[PDB]
Amino acid sequence: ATLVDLFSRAAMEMPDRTALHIDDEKISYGLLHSWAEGLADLLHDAGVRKGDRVALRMPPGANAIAAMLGILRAGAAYVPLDIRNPPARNAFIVTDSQVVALVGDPGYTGPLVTEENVAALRDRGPERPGPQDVAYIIYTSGRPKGVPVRHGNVTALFEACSRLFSFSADDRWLLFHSMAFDFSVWEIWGALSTGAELVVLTPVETARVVRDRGITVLNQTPTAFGALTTAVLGEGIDLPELRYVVFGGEKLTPAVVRPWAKRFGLDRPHLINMYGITETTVHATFHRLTEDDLAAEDSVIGRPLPGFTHRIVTEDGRDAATGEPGELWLAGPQVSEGYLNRPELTAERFTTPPRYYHSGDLVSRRAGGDLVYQGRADLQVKLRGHRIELSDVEAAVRTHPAVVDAVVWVHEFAPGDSRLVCAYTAQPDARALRAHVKTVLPSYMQPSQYLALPELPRTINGKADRASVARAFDERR
Numbered sequence: 208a209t210l211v212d213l214f215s216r217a218a219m220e221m222p223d224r225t226a227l228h229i230d231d232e233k234i235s236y237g238l239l240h241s242w243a244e245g246l247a248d249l250l251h252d253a254g255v256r257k258g259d260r261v262a263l264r265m266p267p268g269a270n271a272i273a274a275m276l277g278i279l280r281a282g283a284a285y286v287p288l289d290i291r292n293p294p295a296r297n298a299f300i301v302t303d304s305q306v307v308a309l310v311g312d313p314g315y316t317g318p319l320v321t322e323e324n325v326a327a328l329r330d331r332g333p334e335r336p337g338p339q340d341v342a343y344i345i346y347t348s349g350r351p352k353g354v355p356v357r358h359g360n361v362t363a364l365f366e367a368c369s370r371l372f373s374f375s376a377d378d379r380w381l382l383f384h385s386m387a388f389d390f391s392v393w394e395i396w397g398a399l400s401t402g403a404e405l406v407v408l409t410p411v412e413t414a415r416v417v418r419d420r421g422i423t424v425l426n427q428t429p430t431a432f433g434a435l436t437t438a439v440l441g442e443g444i445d446l447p448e449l450r451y452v453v454f455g456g457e458k459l460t461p462a463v464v465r466p467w468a469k470r471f472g473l474d475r476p477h478l479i480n481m482y483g484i485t486e487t488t489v490h491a492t493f494h495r496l497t498e499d500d501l502a503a504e505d506s507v508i509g510r511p512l513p514g515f516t517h518r519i520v521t522e523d524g525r526d527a528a529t530g531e532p533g534e535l536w537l538a539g540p541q542v543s544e545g546y547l548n549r550p551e552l553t554a555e556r557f558t559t560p561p562r563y564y565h566s567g568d569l570v571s572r573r574a575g576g577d578l579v580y581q582g583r584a585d586l587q588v589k590l591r592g593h594r595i596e597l598s599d600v601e602a603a604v605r606t607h608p609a610v611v612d613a614v615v616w617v618h619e620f621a622p623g624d625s626r627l628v629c630a631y632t633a634q635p636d637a638r639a640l641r642a643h644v645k646t647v648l649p650s651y652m653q654p655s656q657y658l659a660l661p662e663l664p665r666t667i668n669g670k671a672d673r674a675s676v677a678r679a680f681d682e683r684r
Contacts, residue, residue, distance in 0.1 A: 208338045209358040211279050213400040214240065221376060221402040227269050228420065229407045234269055236402065239276065245328040246277025253318045255308055257282030257334050260344060262301050263386065264288040264311030267407055270325045271386065272395065274310045282334055284341035284355065289387035289667055296351070303548060304344055304353055338362070344547055345389045347485050348666055349674040353547030354485045361392065363540035364488045365400055367512040371493050372451065376402030378423045383408065388667045390455045393489045394426050410438035421448040428456030428669040430612065433463045440470060449476040455483055455490070456669040458580050461501050468501055482508035482580060486556070486564050488541040491515060492578060506580040508570070515539040516561050519570060532581045535570045536563040588617055590625065593651045600627065600654065603647040609635035612663055614671040615654055618680065629654035630676045632662055
């Protein structure tokens, strides 16, 4: 019912198994459970009561996971502040989430449990959260908003994934993502609710430990996976232990999957695409990739998870016919109650008797029931009497061999001067690229300007940060 209940079961029944594995160092379920229960006692002393929220700012590692379990155990919601947060953003989130304490290192004036404080309780009750209680509050961005996910939302996710995956205490999960990215929730509680192991951390170097630590459940975004596949193919690394690669973050194209699939096939490991949004607890669909998916260029996300009811809605509120694009609507136990302190948005994104969340994503239902991601509604744009699929522009640029990644957008140069711009990453001058794109796109879809970048700035979820790339562009033009 709760996540502290999930960790309870696993710690009680398998206390000798390795919970955390950091380098050559190991922490057992029983000791983690003991450490975390001590932390909760600490927090409660500091006045942390049930239903409060606590900021967590720590480098990934044992103290961070212990801190996090501590916070949950005290009955509180944890608010992760990513180390990559500039000071203004941290201050905003802490103020906006109304946190009553912080755990970690401040870069604030409230109650401070340091890291040192956390580290001490290792070698060393309060009331327990319920399913309606908030587990975490994660921020998506641009004005950043908080999504508060409840214990019932998260345990609903793992009950939903129950018979889709075959997980056991024998697995080894890698913790690869920031605790401010909710993909990390799935990583942490994938292992911790099954008795499994959680390995806590160059692509080459990352690839080395995936074999060396015998990772069986790997979670990646498409950008990270391409860099991983290049290192793996390059060194000749083999990963006999790997059972599942699971894909979150940006839309997955067959193109990033094909080289891997050439080397390893699709039988072992299983390649699984999961469409997800923060507002519906990490994951919302499941598709196991097949040779079919590599024959075409469609981004199949498969079928929504078992607890979900859904609709594909037209612009004027109807159910979309088959092959007809539409906005995906999602109802169910994984759907959050709404935003934090965004009563307006919550009003329009969540509507009620299923209560639906409006993804703002376009999808089509194939025959047989499979969903196919078409794109974001917000990225369908009107320019000079034309309607432009920014996503389609991004793909055409991407089809250049020397181009890794690309983001295109409408940029306001002057009050009457709005034009398409593209930023891209190489693995190639704009001239050669310009020449190629004239071949692929009609003139009204061709970017007016090209910006070569070392790497695209991305959100915490790893989706391309449009507001930042625009600002980067304005500054060097």
